[PDB]
Structure 1
């Protein structure tokens, strides 16, 4: 999925926020890996994406 930079922290176990609460929640016992990379060159429009 795609989020903003400030929301990157929300994607983690034991997190709260708009994204965590309403969009995507991880379990407390989550096992895996989260990888976030900027996609400004891919996901930004001059007029607004």
Structure 2
């Protein structure tokens, strides 16, 4: 099992999925088209601001 952690903007959360395109799925973090796993995103405005 591999756990990968980072922080992004809200409207970019939809880019963490197979077969996506953007400024995050192109130059920052890319997922294979045959991904098998899970993602977990949650708001952190209290801490990271």
TM-score, length-scaled by structure 1: 0.86
SS of alignment partner, residue 41 of structure 2 = coil
SS at 1:9 equivalent:
helix
Q: TM-score, normalised by structure 2?
A: 0.86
- Name the structure with the higher helix share: 1
Where does structure 1 differ by over 2 angstroms across 4 or more consecutive aligned residues? none
**Equivalents in 2 of 1:26, 1:12: separation in Å?**
7
Greater Rg, structure 1 or structure 2?
A: 1
Q: Distance in 1 between matches of 2:39 and 2:47?
A: 20
Where structure 2 has 5 or more consecutive residues not aligned to the other structure, the ranges are 1-5
State the aligned residue count. Answer: 44
Question: Larger strand proportion, structure 1 or 2?
Answer: 2
